[model samples]
Target chain A: MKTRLEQVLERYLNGREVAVWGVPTRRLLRALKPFKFHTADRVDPQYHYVVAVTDDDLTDFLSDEQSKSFQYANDYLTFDDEGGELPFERMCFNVPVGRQTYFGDGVVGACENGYIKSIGQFTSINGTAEIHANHQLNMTFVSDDIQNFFNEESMAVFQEKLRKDPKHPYAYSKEPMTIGSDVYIGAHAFINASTVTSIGDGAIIGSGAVVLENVPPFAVVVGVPARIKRYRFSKEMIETLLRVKWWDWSIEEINENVDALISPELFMKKYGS
Target chain B: MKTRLEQVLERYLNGREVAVWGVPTRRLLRALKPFKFHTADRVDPQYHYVVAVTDDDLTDFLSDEQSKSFQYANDYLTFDDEGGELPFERMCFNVPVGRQTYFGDGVVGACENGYIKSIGQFTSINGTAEIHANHQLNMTFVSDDIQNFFNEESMAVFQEKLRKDPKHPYAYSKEPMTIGSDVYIGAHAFINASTVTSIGDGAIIGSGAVVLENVPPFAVVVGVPARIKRYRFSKEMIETLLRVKWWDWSIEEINENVDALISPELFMKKYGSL
Candidate 1:
């Protein structure tokens, strides 16, 4: 029988482009929808996508009960909280039977939290640039200079080349960055690598973390050097886990077991806990 | 004031040596002890040393209740259900601190239902190797003949070399293997270099599982090529975990807030089942 978790995941799989909130960049939007895409802000819009916000249009967007439930989930949700509220601007679109898609705003400049927090203007392919999170891309006319940042030339000429080819660079085309399905990249994280880095499922990359190597499955790696922090399970439990392979289970089955899958408290209570 | 969990951990630490009910191998005993140690049977008991058990002791040593508890903690706790009420063997030990020690009886051989399910000898180590619940070790004996079976020659040669010169192989001297404070290695599991392994505090490992590399904290991994099957905490919950780093806290502090430290249903409730 289809599980409760599978049912919940299926609910989000309707064949329609859904509007998402909190996405700030065009690159993120494009990454989310490589096929048909749109950007509009209208009440009662035809798009299935809806940006979830706790403050602004609470009642209009979600039912009162849903709002309460979401609040409960978010309230318990913890973050580093060293500086301020963490901004989660990424979107994860899970396509159970098909290919799942993820959209993230590339680190443009330095912001806060970790090493890759800041983001400056998108430098041209050949430009040597310092990216920070808060900098404006258009004001410096710096957008033109990103293309030539890496060439054996002056920083100014590199910037000029970047201005010409802002989006598609030969570097990105030659070796596009690829992340694995089970990996979770935190907000404001960046990855610039020539080799394919495969992060195993259930791997957690802390907020503002960066990666430049091939991460093994279930491995937790962090820091600039990205040392292996640890593995998640022991040998016996790992065996049971493989036999279960809950991640590979049908979305429908997961939906049926959604309550068990999502609610650790419930699973613990029902099983040995 | 210390929390309840801290109190429990402290209680275990109060004595210079503590008696543990389910530990089987000397390697695990060495790992758990804060100091050097030795093992003696309950019959030929020795002071300042620990006692370890094999499958043979379960019938007479432990009561039905104690045996059941051990079995609950490890599903592999087996007994022959023969004519009369036959009792299974239980792996238990008492650890003494302040020394370096290694014990071998039967390495973990299998797992079932979230617990270690069986035991077998780790022939790689000279003596019989004990497989503790949820803990694994990687033992590499230098051998030139690849096709030969695990025989006395290899065992004797390896033991003699280790005894003669313990520091010969730098890898063995330099963290030959790592057992996380929370990790458990399964039985008959061959740990090679290719595997990326990691173990979180209090994480349990099944039997007959080989791990090669780093495992995440508080996550479960298993299989021939052990992969992370699931996380103990969700993405949202992990944020809370990073803030908490409970493993770093002292046993006193942990006992004080054991409820907050772990999911009560997961850790405490399982204890009840035991």
Candidate 2:
């Protein structure tokens, strides 16, 4: 018993406030604490000069009114009176805001011009990043250092032999930093969320890569910290593309198995044997 | 032309919504999906008790109206009776809200006393991170496990090898994962954004560094996933501190180069033979 447009989109997104940011030409329109930006039409310094800052403070957020109403009415939140002419080859926009861009649920950030069509959000976007309803963030991930394992000066430098050594059981709360789901970065790859890394789900990053380690699934890695230049198909075609996820067909099951998807022996005689 | 106080400050500074959170001492605020929180003066668990969740959504949003007019004389949209002191030295917070901390703007913390300043955008901070202009982020980056890369069990784990592997060009995407920019994490360093790491640009992370590999620029790494014990200067003084980015000076050029920035051979005899 909810639909009136899902209860006015759940009472305008019940407890709404999902970030759309902008306003920091170097401090003037002050509000204090959420630092950094999004949304503008004229704050100047070429669209409110923001190099870096995000102390953060946003709650129950879901702005752009009930999730962006299918954004791109010239998004950047409709750039200052729809002002055009500034598409000079992705004119370098590090999209800077500093850490934390966790989104999900029918999530779709087609991530502007450089292009990204996401769904399973894990971004560092040096380029564009994406993810569709069934996921599409084929890597553009970026990181500007977030080195933490202990502070307050590592609890006064390792809290005295780590509190009589309980065998290095340090804190900042145990660890579970996982990134798995249709992973595919290849643009200007650089992954380092700090450490304890775990990535295993359809991996394929090449084109000038740079990772430190631990990247299993569908393996195809590349250079500069990146290794393994193989494994996107083999070992049972990566256990059937980790289990065939062709955008989860619709359009009559890819026109009813469009010749078993371009024939790798009729896609392995219809599902690898 | 523009003032009902600059047209409500150019119509609430033409598009506003910056992090300010709450909800999750273990949920009850209702209206599901878009978790990891922010914004609230009260939610009882002593203030909307949140621990983590950020799957975001908030529109036509602009609270604490324009630079907050010196917060808490009724802080634009108040902070629930100005509560006080709960500073327990870094109790991990993953302040997730999917992108745009564009380096210090309206600054509407929902920023009580617990401080943070940021840039570069990717958070779930446990090790206390920082950035300025350029940044301060006492850990608050959000994430909702992207609801599982799009349910139905991630489409049965990619629907059986993309129809049958076209010369091993798989999808779900590739990987690299790197991090850079003035890297000097000395306030309890514990880097982990979930594998495939890389650190460069002014590297000086001691206080426990643990990087799986690859960190070179101004080198001075430390223990755990960290290693490089030296190189804070030299190699042309780390190419003149990566071409004098002494935090990109201007506060009178960092007080006119405060004695050549704590003297590194007088900052390479004044900008090391620039």
Winning candidate number (DockQ): 2
For residues A1-273, write the lDDT of model 1, one tens digit per residue: 322112322344244443433222444444344323343233233334343322213222343232233321122111111111111212112211112222222221111212221111101110111122211233445453354554656666644553454342322222233333334443233444332324444454532234556566556665544656765544444344445544444435444444443333443344321
Across B1-274, the per-residue lDDT of candidate 1 in tens digits comes to 2211122223333343423333333223323445333332332112222222334544444543433322221222111111111122223221110111112333212111112211211102212222222111111111111101224544354444433443322122222233334344554333332222223443444443434455665566665445667876565454454455554566587688777545644543333333
Tell me the whole-model lDDT of each prediction, alpha carbons only: 0.33, 0.35
Model 2: per-residue lDDT, tens digit, B69-145?
A: 32211112212211111111111121212121111111112122112212122212222332111000110101112
Candidate 1 chain B least-lDDT 10 residues? B134-143
DockQ values per model: 0.01, 0.03
Docking class of 1: incorrect
Across residues A96-206, which tens digit of lDDT does each residue of candidate 2 receive? 111122221111122222122121222212221122211112213222122254467744654454334322222222232344544545333444323324556556554
lDDT of 1 at B19: 34
Question: Top TM-score: which candidate number?
Answer: 2
